[PDB]
């Protein structure tokens, strides 16, 4: 359920296409 | 379901076209 | 479903054409 990210870059919960960045 | 993320960049619930940022 | 993001910056649910910031 929640997560509270509050983070500063790529992320996700979890599933096809898994992310990237640079 | 919920997340509740409030983060400050790029994030996926997690589908097709994986994201990317700089 | 639900997500309650109130992050500050790019996010997506996750779909075709992944995203980008600076």
């Known amino acids: 359920p ?3 990210i ?3 870059s790529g992320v996700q ?3 096809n296409n ?3 960045m640079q």
């Open 6 to 8: 509050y983070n500063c």
């Open 2 to 4: 929640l997560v509270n």
């Open 18 to 20: 898994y992310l990237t």
């Open 13 to 15: 919960v979890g599933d």
